[PDB]
Amino acid sequence: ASAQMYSAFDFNCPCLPGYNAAYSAGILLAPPLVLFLLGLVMNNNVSMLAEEWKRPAVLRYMFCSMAQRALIAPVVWVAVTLLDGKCFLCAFCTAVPVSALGAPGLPAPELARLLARVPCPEIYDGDWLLAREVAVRYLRCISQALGWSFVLLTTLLAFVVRSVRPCFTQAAFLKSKYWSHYIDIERKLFDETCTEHAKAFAKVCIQQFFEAMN
Amino acid sequence: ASAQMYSAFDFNCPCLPGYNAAYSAGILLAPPLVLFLLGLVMNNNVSMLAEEWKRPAVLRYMFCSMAQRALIAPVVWVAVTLLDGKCFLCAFCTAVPVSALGAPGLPAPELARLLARVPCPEIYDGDWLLAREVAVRYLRCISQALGWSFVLLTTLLAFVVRSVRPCFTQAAFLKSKYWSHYIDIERKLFDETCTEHAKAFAKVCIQQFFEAMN
Amino acid sequence: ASAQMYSAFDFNCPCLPGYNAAYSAGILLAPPLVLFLLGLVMNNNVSMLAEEWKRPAVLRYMFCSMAQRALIAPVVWVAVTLLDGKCFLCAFCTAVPVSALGAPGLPAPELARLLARVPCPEIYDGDWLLAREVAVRYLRCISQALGWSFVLLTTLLAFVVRSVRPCFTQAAFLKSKYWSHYIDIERKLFDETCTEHAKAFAKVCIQQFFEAMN
Amino acid sequence: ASAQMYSAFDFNCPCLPGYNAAYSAGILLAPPLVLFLLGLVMNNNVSMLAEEWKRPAVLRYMFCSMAQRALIAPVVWVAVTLLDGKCFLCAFCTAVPVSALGAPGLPAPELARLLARVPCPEIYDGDWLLAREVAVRYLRCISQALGWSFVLLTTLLAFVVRSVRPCFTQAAFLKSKYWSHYIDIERKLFDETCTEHAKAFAKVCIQQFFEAMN
Amino acid sequence: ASAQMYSAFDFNCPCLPGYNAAYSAGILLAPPLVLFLLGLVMNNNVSMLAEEWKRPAVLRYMFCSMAQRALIAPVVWVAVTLLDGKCFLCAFCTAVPVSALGAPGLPAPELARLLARVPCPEIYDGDWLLAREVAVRYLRCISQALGWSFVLLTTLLAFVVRSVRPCFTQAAFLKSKYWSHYIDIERKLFDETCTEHAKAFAKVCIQQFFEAMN
Amino acid sequence: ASAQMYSAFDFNCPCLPGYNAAYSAGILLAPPLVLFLLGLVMNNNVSMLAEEWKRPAVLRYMFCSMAQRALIAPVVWVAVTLLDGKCFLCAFCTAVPVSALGAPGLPAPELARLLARVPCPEIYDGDWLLAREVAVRYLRCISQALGWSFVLLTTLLAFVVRSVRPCFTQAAFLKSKYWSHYIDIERKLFDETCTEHAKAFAKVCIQQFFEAMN
Amino acid sequence: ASAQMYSAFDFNCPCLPGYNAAYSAGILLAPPLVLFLLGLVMNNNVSMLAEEWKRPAVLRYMFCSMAQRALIAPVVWVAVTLLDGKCFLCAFCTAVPVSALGAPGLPAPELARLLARVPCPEIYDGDWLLAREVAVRYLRCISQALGWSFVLLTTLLAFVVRSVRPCFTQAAFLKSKYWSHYIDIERKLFDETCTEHAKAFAKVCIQQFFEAMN
Amino acid sequence: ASAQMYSAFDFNCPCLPGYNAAYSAGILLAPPLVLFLLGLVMNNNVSMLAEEWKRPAVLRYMFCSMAQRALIAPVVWVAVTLLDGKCFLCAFCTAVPVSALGAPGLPAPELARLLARVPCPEIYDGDWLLAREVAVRYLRCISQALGWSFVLLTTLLAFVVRSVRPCFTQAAFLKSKYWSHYIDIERKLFDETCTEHAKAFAKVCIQQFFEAMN
Ligand SMILES: CCCCCCCC/C=C\CCCCCCCC(=O)O[C@@H](COC(=O)CCCCCCCCCCCCCCC)COP(=O)([O-])OCC[N+](C)(C)C
Ligand SMILES: CCCCCCCC/C=C\CCCCCCCC(=O)O[C@@H](COC(=O)CCCCCCCCCCCCCCC)COP(=O)([O-])OCC[N+](C)(C)C
Ligand SMILES: CCCCCCCC/C=C\CCCCCCCC(=O)O[C@@H](COC(=O)CCCCCCCCCCCCCCC)COP(=O)([O-])OCC[N+](C)(C)C
Ligand SMILES: CCCCCCCC/C=C\CCCCCCCC(=O)O[C@@H](COC(=O)CCCCCCCCCCCCCCC)COP(=O)([O-])OCC[N+](C)(C)C
Ligand SMILES: CCCCCCCC/C=C\CCCCCCCC(=O)O[C@@H](COC(=O)CCCCCCCCCCCCCCC)COP(=O)([O-])OCC[N+](C)(C)C
Ligand SMILES: CCCCCCCC/C=C\CCCCCCCC(=O)O[C@@H](COC(=O)CCCCCCCCCCCCCCC)COP(=O)([O-])OCC[N+](C)(C)C
C-alpha cells in the first residue's frame, strides 16, 4: 500500500541552486510522517486509549502494539525512495567532485547555477568539466548502496523486537487480552436486547398499520 | 471515488491575462462544494432530520456523523489537485520573478500578455527573460511542497476528532442508537402484515380466476 | 448509462455560417428529451396509471416518484456535454471578439464565412485577426465554468426534494404502499391456481399418452 | 444484438453515378426486414398459431405480442445506420448545391461522374467547386439531425402502446394466459409417464443382460 | 462455429487467367459440403438409423430432424463468404466492362493476362483502361447486394418449415418420441446390474487381497 | 491440441537444391506418426491388452476403439499443414513451369540453384523468367485445393465407420463392456479392505505414541 | 514446467573460436541433469528409501516408479532445445563446407576466427565464401530433422515400458501397495491421539486462565 | 517471491575504475542476507525459541527446520543474478585480456579509465583494442557457465539433507511434535473460557441497556 503511490506520483526536482535541499528533503520526510500517524488513526483501539491516559495496569501495552503494526508503512515508503535514486540526485548534485572523477575550472557562484541543472532535465548546459551521463549513475550508485545499508539496519532491528520480550509478558498482555472480544460482543449483546425491546412498542404503534381501507 | 474523475476530466487553462484567476480558482472550489453536499444527500438519515429541526435530545448528534463520513470526498479531491501542479501554474503564472531566478525588461501591459501565455500550451512567445521549462517545474515545486503541507494539516486534524470526544458520549449517542434498526425493522414489520392482509381480499376477488372455460 | 454513449457517438459540427446553431442546439436538447420519456416507459407502474387518470386518493403520488428516478438520465447527459466543450465551441464561434482578446478588420459577410470555420477542423483559413489555438480554449473555458455552475444549480436543487416533503406524507403514500406487492403476489397467486387447474384436464386428455404400442 | 454487426460488417459505397441509390437504399432496408422475420421465427409461440388461423377468441392476441418483442431489432439497426452518416453520404452525394454553400460550372453529364466520386474514397478529382472535407460533414450533419428526429418519432410512439390498451384487456389475454404453462407442463407430464412406461419393458428385455459368463 | 474459421483461414486468389474459376468456386462449395456431413456425424441418432433403412413407421421422421439442425452450419459459412467480397472479385475479374463504367483497347489474349491480375495483389500492371480502386468496390458492390438477397431467400425459407407441418404430426413423431430417453436409461439401467453383478465375483477373487504379510 | 503447436513451431525451408524434399517431407510425416503412437500410450486400456495378445473373445475389439479415438490427432495435424501452404512451396519449387505461366532460358544445373531459392526468403536472385510473387500464390493455390480435397476424403470416410458396423455388435462389445468398470471398482474395493486392514496393526504399533512425557 | 524457462532464459553464444563447444554443450546437458535430480527430491517416497538400501522384497520397485515420473522433465527440456536451432548453430558453425554448398579460400587459422563469428550476432565480417543467411537455415535444418528423429526415438521407447512389464507384477508391487496410505493415515492417526492427549494437561494448566480480575 | 523483485529493481553499474567491485559485490551479497533473516522473522516458531536457549531435549531441532524453509529465498535470488550476466560484467570488466582474444597497447592508468567504461552504457570510447560487442557476450558467457555450475552445487547438496538424516530421528522430533498443535489449541481453548467468562459481567453491567426511555 506504499509503492503503488510511487507509480503515478510525479517528481519535479526544481533545478534552482538552493531550493533543491527543500524539495529533496521535503519529499523524503513528509509521506512517512503522514503515513505513520494515518494508519494509527485506523486501528479502533486508539480512541479511549488516550482518554484515560491523562487522569493520574496495561499502561505499557496497547500502545506498543499499535506502534508496531502501524510503523511498517513509513519504513517501506522510505526505502523505496532511496533505491530509485531520484530523491538523492536532486539534492547533492551541487557537491560532486568536478576536477576529479568526472577538468577546467570556472567562477564560484555561476558554477552552482550550472551544476545545479544536472538532474534528469534536458536543459543542462553541457560540455565543460562534466558529461551528464557520468554525473548521474555515480550519485545513483551511492544512493543504492546507502539504500541497501539502510534496510539491513531495519530488518535486523526487526529481529530483536520479534525475538526479545520488550513488552511481551504476562503482566498486562494477558490482562489486556481480557478486553479483546468483549466490546464486539457488547455490539451483538445489547443489539439483541435493543432490537428486541424495539419490538415492544412496535406492535403498539403498528395498530393503524394492519388494515382498514384495502 | 474522487481521483477517478481526474483521469478523463480535461483541463483548459485559458492563456488570457486576467481570466486565469477565475478558471484556476473556479476548478479548485466547485467540485469540493458539490461533492460535499452530494454525498450528504445519499445518507438516508437526513430527510426527517432537518424536518423537526425547526419547530422550537440528539440535537448535537446525528448531524456530526453525517458531517464526517461525507467530508472525506472533498478533502481528497482538493489534495490531488495541488499535487498535480496544473491548477497552480495556471493561476500564478503572472507573478514569477523575471529578472532574477529565471534578464532584460519590457513594457508593463504587454508583458502580462506574454507571461500569461506560459502554461503547458505551445503558443509561448519564447526567448526573452525566461525559458518555458524553467518557469514550470518551479511553480510545480511550490505547489507540491504547499500540497504536502496541506495534507499534514488535515490528517493531523483527523487525529483529534477520532481521539477526542467532541460529541461522543452517553448523552444522546446511546439514545440515538435506539433509533438505529427500528426503521428497517418497521420495513419488514408492517410488510408482513401488509403482505398478509393483502392475502385477505386476494381469494375474494380471485373467485373468477380459478377455472370455467378450460 | 449516459456517458457511455458519449464515447463512440461521433460529433460533426458543420462549419457553415448559420446551420451551426441548429446542429449545436440540436444535440443538446434531443437526447435529454428522448432519455427522459424512455426510462419512464420502463417503470411498470405507468400503464394503468394514466388509464384511470382521465375519468373525472393517490392522484399526487405515483407520478412524482417516476418523475424523479427517471429524471436522473437527462440531467447527467446534459452536464457531460457542457464539460467537454465541443457543443459550445460549435455554436458561438461566430461571436468571439476579434479586434480585442484575440487586429485588422475585414468585410462583414465574408468574415462570418471565415470565423465560422474555426472549430476542430483543419480547413481554417488562418492568420488574420485570430490564431486557432487562441480562439478555442477560450470558448472551452466559458463552457466549463458555465458547466460547473449548472451542476451546482441542480445538485443543490436535489437537496430540497430529498430533504423537504413535497409529496412525502401519510395521505396517499401509505395508502399507495398497499398497492406495492399485491400485483406480483397476484402473479404467483393465480398462477398456482392456474397451474393446478391445468392439471385437472391434464390426465383427462393424457389417456392415449400412457402406452399401447411400446 | 444489432450494433455488434455494424462493427465488422464492412461498407463499400461504389462511386458510380447511378448505382449509388441501389447500394445505399439496399443496405438500409434489407437487414431490418431480415432481422424482423428472423426473431419472429425464434418465439416458440408461432408454429401452431398460423396453423388454425385459416380454417374459418384470442384471434387479436398472441400475434400482437410477438409483433412487439420481435420489432425491437429492426428499429435499432435502422437508427444506428442514420447516426453514423455513411449510408446517407453514399446516396445523396449527387445532389449537393455546388455553386452555393460549397464556384465555376461544368458540363452536366461529366459532373455527375465527378461529384459521384466524393464519399470517403481517395480517388476524388479535387479542386473545382468543392473541397472534399466541406462536402462531407455537411451531409453527415443532415443525417444526424434527421436521425435523432427519427428516434423521437419512435420512442414517443413506444409511449402509447405501453400506456394505452390496444389489445390489453380481459377478453382473450386472460384466456390466452391459460395456455401459458400447460404445454411445458405437458413436457414433464407425459415424460414421467413415458419414462416410467419405458421401465415396463426394460426389465423384460434386460433378462440376458444380468450375468452369465462373468 | 463457422465465422471463426474465416478469421485465420487465409485466402490466396491466384492471378492466373483461367485457374481463377477453380480456386474461386473451389472455396465456396467445399467447406459447406464438409461442414454439412460433418455435424451429421456428431448426432448420435444416426448410427442404427441407416442400418435398418435398407431391409425392405418413423421412416419419414428422425432424418428430417438431423437434416435441419445440421444444416445451419453450411448456410452461414456460405453467406459470410459473399458479404466479404474476396471470393467474388477473384472469380469474375475477367468480365468487367472496360471501355465503359471504368478507354483505349488492346489485343484479346494479352488483355486476359492483364485484367486477371487485378485482385488485391500489388503486381497489377496499372494505368490503361482501368484504375485498380475503381475495379474493386464495384465487384464488391455486386457481391454484397447479391449476398443480402441470398440470406433473404433462406431466412424467409426458414419461416415455412418452422411454421408449416412438413413432417410434424402425431403419426410417427409421437411414436418416435417413445425412443427418446429409453437408450440413455438403458445406459444406467444395465450399468447398475452390471456394476452390481461385478460385485458378485469381486469378493470371491479378493480373498488373497485382505491381509497376510502386513 | 494439434494446431496450437503450429503457432510457435517455426519453419525453416533450407534453400538448397536437393535437401528440400527431405526437410519438406520430413515435417509432414513425423509429427503424425509421433502424435499417433503417443496418444495411444495415454489410454489406460493398452497395457495388459498386448500382454495376452501373444499366447496362442474380444480379440477384434478393444483395439479398434483405441485406434479411433487416438487417430484424430494426426489427421488434423496433417490437414492444417496443407492449408497453410508453407510445406508445399518448400518442396516443389524446383518444378514450376518457367517459360509458360510465369521467358528466357538458362543452363540446367545453375537454374536449379536459382529456382530452389524462391520460398519466403529474401535472398532470391530476381528478375529472369519469374517474379517471386507470381511463383508463390500459384503453388499456394495447388496446395489449398489439394488440401480441401484431402479433408473431404477423410470426413466422408469418417461417415462409414460411425454409420456402418465394422466391429460394433453383441459378439464381444457387450462382453468387453463387462470389463468396463470392474477395475476402477477394484481400486476402491481392495482399498477399503487395505485401508481397513492397515488399521489393524495401527493401534498395535501406536502404543508408545499416546503419551508419557507431556 | 520446462518450456516456460526457455521463454525468458537468454542465450549468449560467445563468438570465439574454441569456447563455442563449451557454451554450446554446456547448456544442453546441465539443465537436464539438474531437472532430473530435482524433481526426484520432490517425491516424498525417497527419504527412507535410500536409508535401508545399504544394510545388507520391494528392492526392484519404489525406485523405478520415481525414475519414471521424474524423468519427463529432462526429456522435454532436451527436445525443445534441438527444435529451436540456437544450440546447434552455436556449436558446429566452424565445420560448414565452405567451397561447396555455400568460393575463394583463405588461410587456415584466421578462417576459424571468421567463420566462428556467424551465429545470430551482427558483427560478422561478411562477403567472402558465405552469406550469413545461407549458413544459418542450413544448420537450423539439420538440427530440426535431427530433433524430430530424437523424439521418435524416445516416444517409441515410451511405448515398451508402458506396454511391457519391466517391474510390473504381483511380486512386490502389490506388497508395496500395502505401504501406500498407511503413513498419511499415521498422520491423522496419532494426531487425534496427540491432539486429544494435549487436552489432558490443557485444563490442568488453564486453572489461572478462567477468571479472577475481570 | 524472489525473481519478481529483479523485474523492476533497476541496475546502475557506475563506470568508475575502482568503485565497480563495491557496487558489483554490493548487490550480490546484501539481498541474500536480508532475505535470509527476514523470512526467519516470519515463522512464528522463533520467538520463545531463542528465549530459553541461553539459561544453561529439542536443542538440535526446531532450529534446523527454520534454517531450511527460510534458506530457499537467498539461494534463488543469488542464482538468478549470475544467469542474467549484468552483475558479473560490471565487476571484472577491468581484467579482460586485451591484446589476445579481443591489438595496440596504451598507458597503464588511463587504460583502466577506458576499459572500465565498457558495460552496457553508451559512453564507451570505442575503437582501440576492443569492440564493445566482443567484450560483452564473452564475460556473459563465463557467468552463465559459472552460474549453472553453481546451481548444480546446490541442488545436488539439496539431495543429501532430504535423503540423509541430519536431525531427523525419534530423539526430539517426535517429542517436539508434541508441541505442534497445543498452542493454537490454547488459542481456542482459553478463548472459549475467556469469551464465556466475559458473558458473566456482561448482563451485570448491561442493566441500564435494556430499555427505559423508548
Ligand atoms: C507492490 C508492493 C511493493 C513491495 C515493496 C518491495 C520492496 C521492498 C523493499 C524493502 C522491504 C524492507 C522491509 C523492512 C522490514 C519490515 C518489517 C519491520 O521493519 O517491522 C519493524 C518496524 O519497526 C521497527 O522496529 C523499526 C524501527 C526503526 C526506525 C526507523 C526510522 C523510520 C522513520 C523514518 C526516518 C528516516 C530518517 C533516516 C533516513 C536515512 C517492527 O515492527 P513489526 O510489526 O514487528 O514487523 C513485523 C515483520 N513481519 C511483517 C515480517 C513479521
Ligand atoms: C484510486 C483512488 C485514489 C486514491 C488517492 C491517493 C492519494 C491520497 C492523497 C492524500 C490522502 C489524504 C487523506 C486525508 C485524511 C482523510 C481522513 C479525514 O480527513 O477525515 C476527517 C475529515 O474531516 C476533518 O476533520 C477535516 C476538516 C478540515 C477542513 C478542511 C477544509 C476542506 C474544504 C476545502 C476548502 C479548502 C480551502 C483551502 C485551500 C488550501 C475526519 O472525518 P473522519 O470520518 O473521522 O475520517 C476518518 C479517517 N479514516 C478514514 C482513516 C478512519
Ligand atoms: C452495444 C449495444 C448497442 C446499443 C445501441 C445504442 C444506440 C441506441 C440508439 C437508439 C435507441 C432507440 C430505442 C428505440 C425505442 C425502442 C423501444 C420500441 O421502439 O418499442 C416499440 C417498437 O414497436 C413500435 O411500436 C414502433 C413501430 C414504429 C414503426 C417504425 C418502422 C420500422 C421499420 C423500418 C422502415 C423505416 C423506413 C423509414 C426510414 C426513415 C414497441 O414495442 P415494445 O415491446 O413495447 O418496446 C418496449 C420498450 N422497452 C424495451 C424499454 C420497454
Ligand atoms: C461469431 C459468430 C458469427 C455470427 C455470424 C454473423 C453473420 C450472420 C449472417 C447471416 C445469418 C443468416 C441466418 C440464416 C437463417 C438460419 C436459420 C436457417 O436457415 O434454418 C433453416 C436451414 O435449412 C433450410 O431450410 C434452408 C435450406 C435452403 C437451401 C440452401 C442451400 C445451401 C447449400 C449451399 C449451396 C449454395 C449454392 C447457391 C449459391 C448462391 C431450417 O432449419 P432450422 O433448424 O429450422 O433453423 C432454425 C432457425 N432458428 C435457429 C432461429 C430457430
Ligand atoms: C484451435 C483448434 C484448431 C482447430 C482446427 C481447425 C481446422 C480444422 C480443419 C479440418 C478438420 C477436419 C476434421 C476431420 C474429421 C475428423 C474425424 C475423423 O476423421 O475420425 C475418423 C478418423 O479415422 C479415420 O477413419 C480416417 C482414417 C483415414 C486414413 C488417413 C491417413 C492418416 C495418416 C497420415 C498419412 C497421410 C499421407 C497422405 C498425404 C496426402 C474416425 O475416427 P472417429 O473416432 O470415429 O471420429 C469421430 C468423429 N467425431 C469426432 C465428430 C464424431
Ligand atoms: C516467477 C518465479 C521465478 C522462478 C525462478 C526460475 C529460475 C530457477 C533457477 C534455479 C532454481 C534452483 C533451485 C535450487 C534448489 C532449491 C532447493 C534447496 O536448495 O534447498 C536446500 C537449501 O539449503 C541448502 O541445503 C543449500 C545450502 C548451500 C549453501 C549455499 C550458500 C548460500 C548463501 C549465499 C552466498 C553465496 C556465496 C558464493 C557465491 C558463488 C535445502 O533446504 P530444503 O527445505 O530441504 O529444500 C527443499 C527442496 N524442495 C523445495 C524441492 C523439496
Determine, for residues A144 and H12 on separate chains, whether the beta-carbon distance falls below 8 Å: yes
- CA atoms in the 13 A half-sphere facing the CB of H27: 28
Q: How would you label A76-86 residue by residue, b for 16+ Cβ within 10 Å and e otherwise?
A: bbbbebbbbbb
Residue (of G12, G15, G13) closest to G124 by Cα position: G15
d(CA D211, CA F178): 9
Q: With a 6 A CB cut-off, is F69 part of the ligand 5 pocket?
A: yes
> What technique was this entry resolved by?
cryo-EM
Q: Which residue CA neighbors atom 50 of ligand 4 most closely?
A: D42
User: Is D147's C-beta closer than 6 angstroms to any atom of ligand 3?
Assistant: no
Residues of chain E contacting G178 with CB distance shorter than 8 Å:
213-214
Beta-carbon separation of F155 and E41 below 8 A: yes
| CB distance C73 to C35 below 8 Å | yes
Alpha-carbon distance of E193 to F173, in angstroms, equals: 17
Cα Rg of chain H (Å, integer): 29
- Cα–Cα distance, A190 to H208 (Å, whole number): 10
Which among H131, H158, H197 is the nearest to G41, CB-wise? Answer: H158
Q: Which of H5, H27, H154 to mutate to test the pocket of ligand 6 (most atoms within 8 A of CB)?
A: H154
DSSP H stretches of helix in chain B: 5-8, 20-39, 47-51, 64-69, 73-77, 79-84, 86-89, 108-115, 132-135, 139-155, 173-177, 182-205
Answer for the pair C46, D164: CB distance below 8 angstroms, yes or no. no
Please classify residue E111 by burial: count the beta carbons closer than 10 Å to its beta carbon, then call 0-12 exposed, 13-18 middle and 19+ buried. middle
Q: Where are the beta strands (DSSP E) in D80-194?
A: none
Residue showing cell 548521474: A136
How many other C-beta atoms can be found within 10 angstroms of the C-beta atom of residue H82? 19
Spacing, Cα A83 to ligand 1 middle (Å): 14
Closest atom of ligand 5 to E5 CA is 6
Distance F66 CA to ligand 5 centre (A): 14
Q: How far is the CA of E157 from the centre of ligand 4 (A)?
A: 9
* ∠ CA H204-H207-H213, rounded to 5°: 170
CA angle G84, G89, G90 (to 5 degrees): 110
Which residue reads 450494433 in cell numbers? D3
Chain F residues within 8 A of E198 when measuring between CB atoms: 178, 181-182, 185
Tell me whether C187 touches chain B (CB under 8 Å).
no
Chains that touch B (3 or more CB pairs under 8 A): A, C, D, H
Instruction: Answer yes or no: are the C-beta atoms of E42 and E69 closer than 8 Å.
Output: no
Query: Do the chains contact at G201 and F195, CB–CB below 8 Å?
Result: no
Which atom belonging to ligand 2 lies closest to the Cα atom of B32? Answer: 34
Ligand 3 test: best mutation among D9, D27, D75, most atoms within 8 Å of CB? D75
- Do residues F116 and F20 lie in contact, with contact meaning Cβ atoms separated by under 8 Å? yes
**How far is B134 from chain C, CA to nearest CA, in Å?**
23
Residue D6 backbone dihedrals phi, psi, to 5 degrees: -70, -10
The subunits that touch chain E, with at least 3 C-beta pairs less than 8 Å apart, are C, D, F, G
Identify which of A14, A26, A30 has the shortest CB distance to residue B137: A14
What one-character DSSP code corresponds to residue H14?
-
Under 8 Å CB pairs connecting chains B and C tally to: 91
Asked whether H147 and H86 are in contact (CB, 8 A), the reply is no
Spatial distance between the Cα atoms of B37 and B40, rounded to a whole number of angstroms: 5
Which of D64, D76, D81 most suits a substitution to test ligand 3, by most atoms within 8 Å of the C-beta?
Answer: D76
The dihedral over CA atoms of D40, D46, D47, D50, expressed in degrees to the nearest 10, equals -110
Is F1 touching ligand 5 by the criterion CB < 6 Å? no
Residue B13 · residue B86 · CB < 8 Å: yes
What are the cell numbers at A72? 511498517
Any chain A CB within 8 A of the CB of H149? no
Number of F–H residue contacts, CB under 8 Å: 3
C contact residues 74-103, partner E, Cβ 8 Å cutoff: none
Query: Can you tell me which atom of ligand 1 is nearest the CA of H38?
Result: 51
Cα(B6) to ligand 2 centroid in Å equals 17
CA distance D214 to E202: 11
Q: Tell me, what amino acid is at C86?
A: K
Written in H, E and C, the secondary structure of chain E is: CCCCHHHHCCCCCCCCCCCHHHHHHHHHHHHHHHHHHHHCCCCCCCHHHHHHHHCCCCCCCCCHHHHHHCCCHHHHHCHHHHHHCHHHHCCHHHHCCCCCCCCCCCCHHHHHHHHCCCCCCCCCCCCCCCCHHHHCCCHHHHHHHHHHHHHHHHHCHHHCCCCCCCCCCCCCHHHHHCCCCHHHHHHHHHHHHHHHHHHHHHHHHHHHHCCCCC
- Which residue is closest to G213 within chain A, CA to CA? A175
Chain F environment of E210 (Cβ under 8 Å): 193, 197
Q: What part of F 194-213 touches H (C-beta under 8 Å)? A: 213
Q: Is any Cβ of chain A less than 8 angstroms from the Cβ of H19?
A: yes
Cβ distance B139 to B89 under 8 Å? yes
Residues C102 and C118 sit within 8 Å (Cβ to Cβ): no
Nearest CA to ligand 5 atom 51: E42
What SS3 state is found at A206?
Answer: helix
- Residue H214: closest C-alpha in chain B: B178
Distances (CA, A) of H79 to A187, C207, D130, H9, H84: 54, 81, 71, 16, 9
Q: How far is the CA of E34 from the centre of ligand 5 (A)?
A: 12
* Nearest CA owner, ligand 2 atom 2: B3
Nearest ligand 2 atom to alpha carbon A34: 12
E133 vs D46, D123, D194: nearest CB: D123
Interchain contact H178–F (C-beta under 8 A): yes
**Nearest-CA residue for atom 37 of ligand 4:** E29
Our mutation pick for probing the ligand 5 site, out of F43, F76, F142, counting the most ligand atoms within 8 A of Cβ, is F76
Cell numbers found for residue H194: 475467556
Instruction: Please report, as a single letter, which amino acid is at residue A166.
Output: P
Residue whose C-alpha cell is 435493543: A194
- Choose from B178, B180, B181, B183 for mutation: most chain H CBs within 10 A: B178
Q: Is there an atom of ligand 1 within 6 Å of A75 CB? A: yes
By the 10 Å C-beta count (0-12 exposed, 13-18 middle, 19+ buried), B8 is classed as exposed
E156 vs B172, C210, D38, D40, CA distance in Å? 75, 38, 8, 11
* CB crowding F192-205: b at 16 or more within 10 Å, else e: eebeebbeeeeeee
Which of B149, B128, B147, B16 minimizes the C-alpha distance to B82?
B147
Helix (H) or strand (E) holding F199: helix F182-205
Alpha-carbon span G106 to G109, nearest angstrom: 9
Judged on CB neighbours under 10 Å (0-12, 13-18, 19+), G163 is: middle
Q: In angstroms, rounded to a whole number, what is the distance separating the alpha carbons of residues C15 and C94?
A: 10
Q: Which residue has the cell 444406467?
A: E188
With a CB cutoff of 8 Å and minimum separation 6, the contacts of C79 are C147, C150, C151, C154
Rg (CA), chain B: 29
Cited resolution, angstroms: 3.8
Q: Within 13 A of D12's CA, how many CA atoms are on the CB side?
A: 28
Let me know if C185 is exposed, middle or buried by CB neighbors in 10 A (0-12, 13-18, 19+): middle
Alpha-carbon gap: E117 to the closest alpha carbon of chain F (Å):
10
Q: Are F54 and F48 in contact (CB under 8 A)?
A: no
Q: Answer for the pair D140, D86: CB distance below 8 angstroms, yes or no.
A: no
- 3+ Cβ–Cβ pairs closer than 8 Å linking E and B: no
CB-based touch G/B (3+ pairs, under 8 A): no
- Measured from the CB, is residue C41 less than 6 Å from ligand 3? yes
Distance D35 CA to ligand 3 centre (A): 13
Label residue A3 exposed, middle or buried (CB < 10 Å: 0-12, 13-18, 19+): exposed
Separation of CA D25 and ligand 4 centre (Å):
24
How many Cβ atoms sit within 10 Å of the Cβ of residue H67? Answer: 11
Phi-psi map region of G127: left, alpha, beta (phi>0 left; psi -120 to 50 alpha): alpha
The letter for the amino acid at G123 is I
Contact G143, G83 (CB under 8 A): yes
Nearest Cα residue to atom 20 of ligand 6: H158
Q: Please check whether residue D183 touches C, CB under 8 A.
A: no
What burial class does residue F88 get, using C-beta atoms within 10 Å of its C-beta: 0-12 exposed, 13-18 middle, 19+ buried? buried
Best residue in H88, H134, H205 for a mutation probing chain G (most G CBs within 10 Å): H134
Cα–Cα nearest to C113, from C124, C101, C97:
C124
Q: Distance between CA A32 and CA D37 in Å, rounded?
A: 68
